[PDB]
């Protein structure tokens, strides 16, 4: 009995492989060969958000493109006025082992979670003046690895228990549970139009989900190890994935397959982040080797380096308007580059 | 107006600096171990779908956060990357043989993986009384699972408890040797294993081992090790 379903699974996977091969008429590098490279895209540290007690794990830009919320293992989420480097809030967490934080597009809420499995939502605009927990989204059976807001009410979380969930922050319940991974779902990023999101997992495959339907539409594969980071290309129709295999890849949704891969024989450190600059011409990736590297997203080779960290960079958020790129670090400095 | 925002920033820095001293003086510890290990009873001994069960205890004006990890998947290689700045990873094993090989595989995994190279491992061989009874009654013969035990002999420098019979001495020292073999196989010295047999004293044992870790880190920092 079961062997029949195993055979059909194998042959369906073969159908998908054949169809993907049929679509591959010209790999990206071929069509992009003619354009001039981005050149020497060097950058310099303009600011440095000094003040965390311990290693950082997230640094997300508000929709105003000026505040950055940095979350650290010290049990702190600090909101940085990135032009002046003032600290506008310090948000003491319940459980200090944070692994992700997010800034709502309105700036009203800051979400944060980690090994506690509870995705907290903090309210910044309280009448009492001080920050306080608005809701605590209990319900996962594993560490809440990454989360982002769809809107002030709906938040989407990717967790260690292989699921992703669409919560309702007013009720606190899971309005929809996404499932289909076979490992830890270590990364997530909602698309620019918020109609769907992707989540990369330690099964080394990245899955695209639509929040209006509740199931994976497409599955992408090609890494040789866990996917540590994922990020949508600003067009909302392609996304980058970066893995502990020290290589990151560009997937195109309509192409249903990987189109370019960013690697150089001298890099062996595992990825930790991926993020495009607003035009989509620069792909920024964070590494365990203490550096962050700048990749020409279409000429498909390295074009710049960000340096000066003592430890690995935990996150590499780029501002909404593109004016800067932040880099959180395990040495506690949030370097702001431009 | 903006200078008032600068003052706000200074106030936040004062808050962070008052927290820095506490964070610095308080000691983080992980508590790994098999489900059948005594980690639960060790946590019960110590005194002041959730994924983590931080408990706090104090000895001689040093206080510790022991982070008993709760509901998480068994693929530890990810949620372990958070803990790679603890002062010591307590690992607890049931010394009663069989699944001891799984405990040894855990220890290998804990000792060697790439992020933990500077973290000392405190290994509580718990449940010692049950091992002793199981050996004494002959309910299981360790040779059945470790052929070397048929050729191994007690060390000439062992110090068993008075009244302890040589059988359980053979057993204990064998098992501790088998773990310490994994410990020494890295041959790098940058982190050290502290096995114990085990009450009331387990807190004091953690304190002693942590004292040694802190002393060695101090020597290493000053380039004087």
């Amino acid at each position: 009995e079961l062997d029949q379903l195993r055979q059909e699974a194998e042959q369906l996977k073969n159908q998908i492989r054949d169809a993907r091969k049929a679509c591959a008429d010209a790999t990206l590098s071929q069509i992009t060969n003619n354009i001039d490279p981005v050149g020497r895209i060097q950058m310099r540290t303009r600011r440095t958000l000094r003040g965390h007690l311990a290693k950082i794990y997230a640094m997300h830009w508000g929709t105003d493109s000026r505040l950055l919320v940095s979350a650290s293992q010290d049990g702190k989420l600090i909101i940085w006025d990135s032009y002046t480097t003032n600290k506008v809030h310090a948000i003491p967490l319940r459980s200090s082992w944070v692994m992700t934080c997010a800034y709502a597009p309105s700036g009203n809420y800051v979400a944060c979670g980690g090994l506690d499995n509870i995705c907290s939502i903090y309210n910044l605009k309280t009448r009492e003046g001080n920050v306080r927990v608005s809701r605590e989204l209990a319900g996962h059976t594993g560490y809440l690895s990454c989360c982002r807001f769809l809107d002030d009410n709906q938040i989407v979380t990717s967790s260690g228990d292989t699921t992703c969930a669409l919560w309702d922050i007013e009720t606190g319940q899971q309005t929809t549970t996404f499932t289909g991974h076979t490992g830890d779902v270590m990364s997530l990023s909602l698309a620019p139009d918020t109609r769907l999101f992707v989540s990369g997992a330690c099964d080394a495959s990245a899955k695209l989900w639509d929040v209006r339907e509740g199931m994976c539409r497409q599955t992408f594969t090609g890494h040789e190890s866990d996917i540590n980071a994922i990020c949508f290309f600003p067009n909302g129709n392609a996304f980058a994935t970066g893995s502990d295999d020290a290589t990151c890849r560009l997937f195109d949704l309509r192409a249903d397959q990987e189109l370019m891969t960013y690697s150089h024989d001298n890099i062996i450190c595992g990825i930790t982040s991926v993020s495009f600059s607003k035009s989509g011409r620069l792909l920024l990736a964070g590494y365990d080797d203490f550096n962050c590297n700048v990749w020409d997203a279409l000429k498909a080779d390295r074009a710049g380096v960000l340096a000066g960290h003592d430890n690995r960079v935990s996150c590499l958020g780029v501002t909404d308007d593109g004016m800067a790129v932040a880099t959180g670090s395990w040495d506690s400095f949030l370097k702001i580059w431009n | 107006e903006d200078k008032a925002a600068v003052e706000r920033s200074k106030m936040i820095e004062k808050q962070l600096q008052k927290d820095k001293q506490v964070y610095r003086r308080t000691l983080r510890l992980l508590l790994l171990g098999a489900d059948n290990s005594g980690k639960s009873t060790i946590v019960k001994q110590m005194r002041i779908t959730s994924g983590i069960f931080e408990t706090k205890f104090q000895v001689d004006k040093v206080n510790f956060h022991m982070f008993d990890v709760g509901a998480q998947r068994d693929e530890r290689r990810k949620w372990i990357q958070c803990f790679n700045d603890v002062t010591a990873i307590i690992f607890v094993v049931d010394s009663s043989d069989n699944r001891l090989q799984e405990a040894l595989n855990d220890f290998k995994s804990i000792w060697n993986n790439r992020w933990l190279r500077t973290i000392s491992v405190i290994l509580f061989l718990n449940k010692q009384d049950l091992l002793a009874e199981k050996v004494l009654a002959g309910k299981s013969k360790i040779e059945d699972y470790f052929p070397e035990f048929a050729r191994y002999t007690t060390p000439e420098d062992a110090t068993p408890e008075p009244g302890e019979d040589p059988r359980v001495t053979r057993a204990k020292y064998f098992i501790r040797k088998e773990f310490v073999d994994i410990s020494t196989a890295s041959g790098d010295g940058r982190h050290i294993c502290y096995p114990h047999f085990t009450d009331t004293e387990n807190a004091r044992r953690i304190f002693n081992d942590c004292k040694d870790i802190i002393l060695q880190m101090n020597l290493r920092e000053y380039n004087l090790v």
Partner: single-chain antibody
Framework: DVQLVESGGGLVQPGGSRKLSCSAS????????MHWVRQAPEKGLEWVAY????????YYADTVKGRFTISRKNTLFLQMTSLRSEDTAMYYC??????????????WGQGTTLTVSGSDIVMTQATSSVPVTPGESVSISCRSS???????????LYWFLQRPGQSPQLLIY???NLASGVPDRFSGSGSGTAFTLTISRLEAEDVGVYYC?????????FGAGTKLELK
């Protein structure tokens, strides 16, 4: 609820001394800067004193310096000495927390009466009273001796409404931002030295006297204020 209650005022002979008090609840008092603002029985508002969060700094008005003194346990105190005839006024406790996007002066106390038996930035208004009717739309204006645009690009005008016989409320802060809980009927604009506030589809809840205020530098001089009155 967020709440402020000042207390301790009363009748004083000229040259006397007294302590005014402010009490707070429902908000993280120690992180707020606390102001004092006063109102003569037949005049516009005047700024009095400021004490920052954590007591980092203190200021006073040019006609108040030294004679009064301020200190902040969810309470604040206002020392007074050599009390003048002109010190007769209704005194309001005012909170203000300062950071990017913050909303200073967002809450005013009930107010205590106390009765005694040129380098500044100064405000003026080309009007003192205006007829208005519900359903109609109205406007007001305010003018400055200095351009209130700080080098960072914010214009630091603040608009307050004093409904008759009660505490003021913040209408618009830094010359564009509508304060929370304010009906969306309001709007405002700023042009460096000259500023306006506008009401579309008035309702009787908006009747009262309107005070503009500059916040670029101490002392925080209020304008004389414009009355908008029914029919």
């Amino acid at each position: 609820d967020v709440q402020l209650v000042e207390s301790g005022g009363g009748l004083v002979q000229p040259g006397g001394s007294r302590k005014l008090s402010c009490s707070a609840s429902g908000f993280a008092f120690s992180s707020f800067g606390m102001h004092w603002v006063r109102q003569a029985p037949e005049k516009g508002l005047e700024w009095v004193a400021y004490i920052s969060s954590g007591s980092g700094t203190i200021y006073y008005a040019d006609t108040v310096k030294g004679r009064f003194t301020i200190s902040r346990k969810n309470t604040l105190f206002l020392q007074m000495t050599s009390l003048r005839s002109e010190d007769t006024a209704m005194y309001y406790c005012v909170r203000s927390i300062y950071y990017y996007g913050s909303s200073p002066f967002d809450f005013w106390g009930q107010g205590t009466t106390l009765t005694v038996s040129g380098s500044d930035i100064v405000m003026t208004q080309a009007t003192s009273s205006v007829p208005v009717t519900p359903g109609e739309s109205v406007s007001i204006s305010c003018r400055s001796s200095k351009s209130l645009l700080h080098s960072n690009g914010n214009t630091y005008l603040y608009w307050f409404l004093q409904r008759p016989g009660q505490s003021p409320q913040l209408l618009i802060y830094r010359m564009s931002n509508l304060a929370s809980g304010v009906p969306d009927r309001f709007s405002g604009s700023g042009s460096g030295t000259a500023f306006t506030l506008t009401i579309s589809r008035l309702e009787a809840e908006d009747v009262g006297v309107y005070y503009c205020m500059q916040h670029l530098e101490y002392p925080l001089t209020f304008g004389a204020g414009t009355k908008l009155e029914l029919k």
